[PDB]
Design a protein around this motif. Structure first.
Motif, short mmCIF file in Angstrom:
data_model
loop_
_atom_site.label_atom_id
_atom_site.label_comp_id
_atom_site.label_asym_id
_atom_site.label_seq_id
_atom_site.Cartn_x
_atom_site.Cartn_y
_atom_site.Cartn_z
N UNK A 113 127.47 86.19 -68.15
CA UNK A 113 126.69 85.43 -69.43
C UNK A 113 126.68 83.89 -69.09
N UNK A 114 127.95 83.52 -68.38
CA UNK A 114 128.00 82.28 -67.92
C UNK A 114 126.80 81.84 -66.84
N UNK A 115 126.82 82.62 -65.86
CA UNK A 115 125.99 82.21 -64.81
C UNK A 115 124.25 82.48 -65.27
N UNK A 116 124.50 83.28 -66.11
CA UNK A 116 123.16 83.42 -66.73
C UNK A 116 122.38 82.35 -67.53
N UNK A 117 123.28 81.71 -68.32
CA UNK A 117 123.22 80.63 -69.07
C UNK A 117 122.89 79.37 -68.29
N UNK A 118 123.50 79.16 -67.12
CA UNK A 118 123.44 78.01 -66.31
C UNK A 118 121.98 77.86 -65.60
N UNK A 119 121.58 79.39 -65.02
CA UNK A 119 120.46 79.53 -64.33
C UNK A 119 119.18 79.25 -65.27
N UNK A 120 119.40 79.51 -66.39
CA UNK A 120 118.36 79.56 -67.48
C UNK A 120 118.09 78.25 -68.02
N UNK A 121 118.95 77.19 -67.88
CA UNK A 121 118.82 75.88 -68.24
C UNK A 121 119.01 75.92 -69.72
N UNK A 122 119.77 76.60 -70.38
CA UNK A 122 119.85 76.82 -71.92
C UNK A 122 120.97 76.16 -72.12
N UNK A 123 120.93 75.73 -73.66
CA UNK A 123 122.26 75.19 -74.17
C UNK A 123 122.97 76.20 -74.64
N UNK B 127 110.17 64.05 -60.89
CA UNK B 127 110.78 64.92 -61.72
C UNK B 127 110.84 64.46 -63.18
N UNK B 128 111.02 65.17 -64.01
CA UNK B 128 111.21 65.10 -65.68
C UNK B 128 112.64 64.85 -65.45
N UNK B 129 113.35 64.61 -66.56
CA UNK B 129 114.79 64.76 -66.71
C UNK B 129 115.28 66.26 -66.73
N UNK B 130 114.79 67.17 -67.46
CA UNK B 130 115.14 68.44 -67.51
C UNK B 130 114.85 69.30 -66.15
N UNK B 131 113.67 68.91 -65.59
CA UNK B 131 113.43 69.66 -64.30
C UNK B 131 114.30 69.23 -63.02
N UNK B 132 114.78 67.92 -63.14
CA UNK B 132 115.44 67.25 -62.26
C UNK B 132 117.21 67.86 -62.44
#
Length: 805
Positions: free
Chosen positions: A547-557, A155-160
Motif C-alpha cells: 500500500x505504501x509502494x502503491x501510493x508512491x507510484x501513483x503520485x497520490x496524497x 516538466x510541470x511541478x507534479x510531473x517533475x
C-alpha cells in the motif's frame, strides 16, 4: 566537449572589483565588447539562434551573475531579476554548460502546462541544432521518447516530482546533472507549489548523504523576495539580485483626471482625447491613447462579467469613430481569418466575441475553452487584437506582453488585490527590444486611493515553509507525502536518517526551535497506523508496504489514498459493466470544487435517468431523498463530517458530466443539460485525466489486475474526450476529437489506414466540418486545409515507422 562555454579573460576580475567597491564606476572599466555574446566560446549553432532575433549582447547583471562566484564551477545558484530582463538566458547558458561538458541530463521545471509547452518549443528551437533532445512532461501528456534517450526534460511541478521518484527506484539518479526552477517564490504556499519544496529537499537530502565534487546543481530563479537570502542558504546556493530592466516601467495610479507616480508626485494630468458619452473613468480614453501610437493594451478586470461588458463598450466607441479624432487602423483580412478559426471550433463563435473581435477587441477568462484562449493570445501577440480585457487568470499564464497595462480596480472579487497578483499584471508591460517603456496604470476612486498606493509601494510576502504545524493540527498533508516519499523510495531507513533529513528542509533554514523535529516523528506514526509503512526493530528500522509502494507510484496524497483504497475494494465486490458510469465514478476527482452545482437541474435529470445508471447511483450512495433535500432547501449542513454525502452527490454529478464528455456529446449540449460553462468542463477533464492515470497505476501496484484493465483506457478518453474507436487516431499530434471523428466516419479507423490515405481526399473530408488558413492546432502555423492534410498523412507514416519526433 572540452569547454562549451568559457568567459572572456579577466572579465570576472573587473566585475569582482566593481562589486567590492563602495560605489560603481561612472564608466565601467572593462571592454564593453566583452559582454558581446560571441566572445564566450559559444558553439556556432546556438550563437546564431540567439542572434536570430535580438540577443546579441549580455546585460551588466547577466555577466556578474555567472562570473561572480563559483556558478560556472558547479555551485548552486539562486538569482532574482524583473521579468523580461533576460532571466531565461542565464539559465540557458548554464544548462548548455553542464549538459555538453559534464554529459549529464538537465531538468527544467515550470509552474503551468501552458508555459511549459511554450518553453518546450522555445527550448527545442534553440538546442535542436546541437543534437540536444528536448521533450516534455506536462499534465497528462507523455513523451514519445524514453527518458534514457533525452537531454532536457521540461516538466510541470507534479510531473517533475514524479520523475524524481522514478529515478530513485531505478537508482538512475546519477543521470540527472542539474535542475532549473522558474518562479521559485511559489514555494511558499500553493495548491501544488509545495511539491516544489518536496522535490528540492529530496535532492538536497540525497546529495547530503553522499557528502558523508559537483553532484547535482540547482539553478533557481524568482521575483524579489524579502527572505530570498534565506532560500539561498537552504539550497546552499550563491545569491544574486538586481533591479536592472532594459525598459523602464512606470507604475502609476489614476485618480480623477490626475495620474500619479509611486511617490504620489503627479507625473501627468489627464484630459480625455475623446468623449465616451458615458460616465467613465476615462477607461476607453486611456485605451484609445495607446492604440493611436500603434500599440496594444492589456486591461485587467475583477469579474468574468466585467471583461465581456468592457470589451463590448470599447468595441462600440471604435464603431462610432469610424462612421464619424483618427480611426483604429486595423487589419480586416487577417481579422476575418481569426474569426473563421473561431467559427470552426467545437465551441463555435461566442456572441460577444462576434461583436468585438471584428474591431480588434477581445476578452479572456476561465469561461472560455483552452482553444479559444489560444486563438486570442495568438491574435493579441501578432497585433491583430489591440485591446484585450482579461481577468487575473491570464496574469499568471503564458508570456504575453503589451505596451500599456490597465487595472480597472484594486478590488478583485470583493477583496483587495493580492500584491503578488498586482506585480504579475504590471510585469507584462514592456517588450524587450521593441518598446521604449512599459506603462502601468491603476485606475481608482477617492475612497480607495490609499489602498492603490499601497500596491505600488508594495513587496512580496516572505516565503512560508508550507510544512508548518499550527498547535493542534500536528500532522499535515504536505509533510506526510514528503515523509512517505523518502521511506518508500528507500533513501531513509533508520531513525538516524530521519533527523538527517530534517536538516535539509527549508523549514530548518528558517531558524538559523527544533519543535518541528517532533512533527516528523508524528508522520512516521501516521504511516504505521494506516498500513503505509512497516517497522522492524542502532534504532528501529522501517520499510514500505504494498500500500505504501502503491501510493508512491501513483503520485497520490496519502490522506486521500485511504478513501480511494476503500472505494476500490467495495467496487470490486459488485461492479456494473453494462455502462461506463461505475468506472468513471472511481476516476472522478473531488478534491476541489470545479463548479457551483445547480441541484434543481440535477433532480430533473435524475427522474429521466436510465435504469442502468440508477443502479450505479444506488450502489454508490446516491439517495433520491438527499437530492430532494437539496432542491427544496439549500442546506449545506455539513454539521457532521458524515455529511460527505454531499461529496458523494457532487462526485456522482461530476461523473455524469464526464460520461457525456467521453461519449462525444457537444460541449454546448452538456452546458444546457447540467448548467456549467465550457471552461469549467475542460478544466474538469484535464483534472480527471490526470486522476484517472493515478488510479490506474494504484490499481496496478496492488495487483488488482481486473480493475486496472478497465481503467487503463480512460486517461486517453478523458484527455481528448473521445470514445474507444478514436483511441488509435488521436495518437497523431494534429488530430483532436472532431477531426478524428470525421476521418473515422470516412473510413480511416487506424493509423495504418491513415498512412495509405490520399492527400486530396483528406482536404475534402476537412471541408465538411465547416488558401484560407482556417484550422487551429497547438503550436500551430495556422494550417491551411491543404497543409494540414499533407502533414497528418506524413505524420501517420512517421508514427507507423516510429522514426523520430
Amino acid at each position: 566537449s572540452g569547454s562549451v562555454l568559457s568567459p572572456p579573460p579577466g572579465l570576472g576580475r573587473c566585475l569582482k572589483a566593481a562589486a567590492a567597491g563602495e560605489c560603481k564606476p561612472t564608466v565601467p572599466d572593462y571592454e564593453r565588447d566583452k559582454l558581446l555574446l560571441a566572445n564566450w566560446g559559444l558553439p556556432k549553432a546556438v550563437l546564431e539562434k540567439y542572434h536570430s532575433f535580438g540577443v546579441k549582447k549580455m546585460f551588466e547583471w547577466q555577466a556578474e551573475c555567472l562570473l561572480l562566484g563559483q556558478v560556472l564551477e558547479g555551485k548552486n545558484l539562486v538569482y532574482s531579476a524583473p521579468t523580461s530582463a533576460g532571466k531565461t538566458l542565464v539559465a540557458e547558458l548554464l544548462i548548455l554548460k553542464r549538459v555538453l561538458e559534464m554529459r549529464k541530463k538537465a531538468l527544467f521545471i515550470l509552474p503551468f502546462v501552458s508555459v511549459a509547452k511554450e518553453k518546450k518549443y522555445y527550448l527545442q528551437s534553440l538546442f535542436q541544432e546541437v543534437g540536444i533532445k528536448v521533450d516534455g512532461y506536462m499534465g497528462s501528456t507523455s513523451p514519445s521518447r524514453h527518458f534514457s534517450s533525452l537531454d532536457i526534460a521540461v516538466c510541470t511541478i507534479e510531473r517533475a516530482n514524479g520523475l524524481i521518484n522514478r529515478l530513485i527506484e531505478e537508482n538512475k539518479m546519477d543521470l540527472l546533472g542539474m535542475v532549473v526552477v522558474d518562479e521559485l517564490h511559489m514555494l511558499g504556499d500553493s495548491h501544488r507549489g509545495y511539491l516544489l519544496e518536496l522535490l528540492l529537499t529530496k535532492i538536497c537530502y540525497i546529495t547530503r548523504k553522499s557528502a558523508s565534487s559537483n553532484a547535482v546543481q540547482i539553478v533557481g530563479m524568482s521575483a524579489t523576495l524579502p527572505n530570498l537570502e534565506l532560500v539561498a542558504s537552504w539550497l546552499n546556493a550563491e545569491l544574486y539580485h538586481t533591479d536592472f530592466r532594459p525598459v523602464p516601467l512606470l507604475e502609476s495610479v489614476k485618480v480623477g483626471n490626475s495620474i500619479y507616480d509611486s511617490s504620489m508626485k503627479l507625473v501627468r494630468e489627464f484630459e480625455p482625447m475623446l468623449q465616451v458619452k458615458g460616465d467613465e473613468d476615462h477607461v476607453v480614453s486611456l485605451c484609445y491613447e495607446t492604440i493611436c501610437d500603434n500599440h496594444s493594451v492589456l486591461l485587467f478586470c475583477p469579474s468574468k462579467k466585467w471583461c465581456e461588458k468592457l470589451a463590448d463598450i470599447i468595441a462600440r466607441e471604435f464603431y462610432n469613430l469610424h462612421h464619424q479624432c483618427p480611426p483604429v487602423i486595423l487589419e480586416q483580412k487577417e481579422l476575418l481569418e481569426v474569426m473563421d478559426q473561431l467559427r470552426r471550433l467545437p465551441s463555435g463563435l461566442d456572441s460577444v466575441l462576434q461583436k468585438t473581435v471584428p474591431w480588434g477587441v477581445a476578452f479572456h477568462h476561465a469561461g472560455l475553452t483552452f482553444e479559444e484562449r489560444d486563438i486570442i493570445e495568438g491574435a493579441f501577440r501578432q497585433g491583430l487584437i489591440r485591446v484585450l480585457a482579461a481577468t487575473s487568470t491570464l496574469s499568471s499564464g503564458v508570456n504575453l506582453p503589451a505596451r500599456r497595462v490597465i487595472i480597472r480596480t484594486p478590488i478583485f472579487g470583493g477583496r483587495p488585490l493580492d500584491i503578488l497578483t498586482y506585480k504579475q499584471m504590471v510585469g507584462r508591460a514592456g517588450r524587450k527590444g521593441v518598446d521604449t517603456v512599459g506603462e502601468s496604470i491603476l485606475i481608482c476612486k477617492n475612497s480607495e486611493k490609499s489602498k492603490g498606493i499601497a500596491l505600488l509601494q508594495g513587496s512580496l510576502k516572505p516565503v512560508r515553509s508550507c510544512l508548518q504545524r499550527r498547535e493542534g493540527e500536528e500532522v499535515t498533508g504536505s509533510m506526510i507525502r514528503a515523509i512517505l516519499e523518502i521511506i518508500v523510495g528507500g533513501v531513509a531507513s533508520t531513525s538516524q536518517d530521519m533527523h538527517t533529513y530534517a536538516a535539509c528542509t527549508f523549514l530548518a533554514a528558517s531558524m538559523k526551535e527544533s519543535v518541528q523535529l517532533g512533527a516528523i516523528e508524528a508522520c512516521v506514526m501516521w504511516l504505521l497506523e494506516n498500513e503505509f509503512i512497516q517497522s522492524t526493530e542502532e534504532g528501529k528500522v522501517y520499510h514500505p508496504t504494498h500500500l505504501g509502494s502503491a501510493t508512491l507510484s501513483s503520485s497520490l496524497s496519502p490522506a486521500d489514498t485511504l478513501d480511494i483504497f476503500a472505494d476500490l475494494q467495495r467496487a470490486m465486490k459488485g461492479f456494473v459493466l453494462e455502462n461506463d458510469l461505475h468506472i468513471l465514478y472511481l476516476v472522478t476527482p473531488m478534491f476541489e470544487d470545479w463548479t457551483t452545482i445547480d441541484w434543481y437541474r440535477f433532480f430533473c435529470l435524475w427522474e429521466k435517468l436510465p435504469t442502468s445508471m440508477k443502479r450505479v447511483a444506488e450502489l454508490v450512495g446516491v439517495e433520491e431523498g438527499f437530492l430532494a433535500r437539496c432542491v427544496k432547501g439549500k442546506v449545506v449542513a455539513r454539521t457532521e463530517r458524515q455529511h460527505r454525502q454531499m461529496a458523494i452527490h457532487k462526485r456522482f454529478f461530476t461523473s455524469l458530466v464526464l460520461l457525456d464528455l467521453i461519449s462525444e456529446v457537444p460541449l454546448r449540449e452538456i452546458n444546457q443539460k447540467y448548467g456549467c460553462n465550457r471552461g469549467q468542463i475542460q478544466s474538469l477533464q484535464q483534472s480527471a485525466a490526470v486522476y484517472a492515470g493515478m488510479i490506474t497505476v494504484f490499481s496496478n501496484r496492488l495487483g488488482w489486475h481486473n480493475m486496472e484493465l478497465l481503467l487503463s483506457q480512460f486517461q486517453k478518453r478523458l484527455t481528448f474526450g473521445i470514445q474507444r474507436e478514436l483511441c488509435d487516431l488521436v495518437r497523431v499530434s494534429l488530430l483532436n476529437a472532431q477531426r478524428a471523428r470525421v476521418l473515422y466516419a470516412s473510413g480511416f479507423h487506424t493509423v495504418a489506414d491513415l498512412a495509405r490515405a490520399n492527400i486530396v481526399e483528406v482536404e475534402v473530408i476537412l471541408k465538411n466540418a465547416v488558401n484560407m488558413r482556417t484550422i487551429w492546432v497547438t503550436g500551430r502555423k495556422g494550417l491551411t486545409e491543404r497543409e494540414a492534410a499533407a502533414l497528418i498523412v506524413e505524420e501517420a507514416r512517421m508514427i507507423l515507422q516510429q522514426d523520430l519526433v
